[PDB]
């Protein structure tokens, strides 16, 4: 997250870190056994880290749980990033407590102007790299479809929407992918892609969770 | 043959390679400069 602020400790109890030796992507806990992330965050093995604030310091109150199943959307495409969403089934259920809990799925599509919260342990710089120990947060609004498309001609599919600031300075970044965009208490987006981070006229591009609510339900049921 | 463009985060020209994540979403900034030099 570029241009954000350090979140209050454990105030986003749905936020997870995906770890394959190091933090590399985010995700969101949507049920005791299931996490939503981005399909481009797939790796054969992933450890889900729940309850984190400082991802470098073992506080003794996290939960570290292997992914048992890692299921990319069947119409995900690496080259276009269409349908950039995936489900992770945890190998053991998460224990729900004040620091580890679920985020609700969306019940309406995302809407322009809506004020949301984006979070993660991704890069905090537009130029170079600084990966934070503590979880970062960014308040940002949904952009219009027109603005999204004008920012990225030829590249915005029906699965994609833009959130952020056309003036730059404030955006998600590398190693935020997979993490949440929460609006009015519901998971509306998955961090996906952008041209650089926090540049003028290059807002973040996010996967519309709402389009996948039935897929999520059906996948969970098929893998129970 | 080889293709180069400017990577905003790195401040340098980089080679476009097949198979990158989101390759078809790439912005090939300053392609003519980076080709010319590299």
């Amino acid at each position: 997250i570029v241009g954000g602020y350090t979140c209050e400790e454990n105030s986003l109890p749905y936020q997870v870190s995906l770890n394959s030796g190091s933090h590399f992507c985010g995700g969101s806990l949507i049920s005791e056994q299931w996490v939503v992330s981005a399909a481009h965050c797939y790796k054969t093995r992933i450890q889900v880290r729940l309850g984190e604030h400082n991802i470098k310091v073992l506080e003794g109150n996290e939960q570290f749980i292997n992914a048992a199943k890692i299921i990319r959307h069947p119409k995900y495409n690496r080259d276009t990033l269409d349908n950039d969403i995936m489900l992770i089934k945890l190998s053991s259920p998460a224990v729900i407590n004040a620091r580890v809990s679920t985020i609700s799925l969306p019940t309406a599509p995302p809407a322009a102007g809506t004020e949301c919260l984006i979070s993660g342990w991704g890069n905090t710089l537009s130029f170079g790299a600084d990966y934070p120990d503590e979880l970062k947060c960014l308040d940002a609004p949904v952009l219009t479809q027109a603005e999204c498309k004008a920012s990225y001609p030829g590249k915005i599919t029906n699965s994609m929407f833009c959130v952020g600031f056309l003036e730059g300075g404030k955006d998600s970044c590398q190693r935020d992918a997979g993490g949440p965009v929460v609006c009015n208490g519901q998971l509306q987006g998955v961090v996906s892609w952008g041209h650089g981070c926090a540049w003028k006229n290059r807002p973040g591009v996010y996967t519309k969770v709402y389009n996948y609510v039935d897929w999520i339900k059906d996948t969970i049921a098929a893998n129970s | 043959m080889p293709r180069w463009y400017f990577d905003l985060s790195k401040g340098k020209c980089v080679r476009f390679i097949y198979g990158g994540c989101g390759g078809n979403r790439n912005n090939f900034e300053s392609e003519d400069y980076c080709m010319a030099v590299c």
Binding site: A38, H40, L81, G122, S172, C173, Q174, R175, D176, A177, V191, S192, W193, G194, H195, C197, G204, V205 | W4, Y5, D7, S9, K10, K12, C13, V14, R15, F16, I17, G20, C21, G22, G23, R25, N26, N27, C34, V37, C38
Partner: peptide, 14 residues
């Protein structure tokens, strides 16, 4: 030529 990086392109994926 220092501007001609041998490093793989970051690309757009976050």
């Amino acid at each position: 030529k220092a501007v001609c990086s041998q490093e793989a392109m970051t690309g757009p994926c976050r």
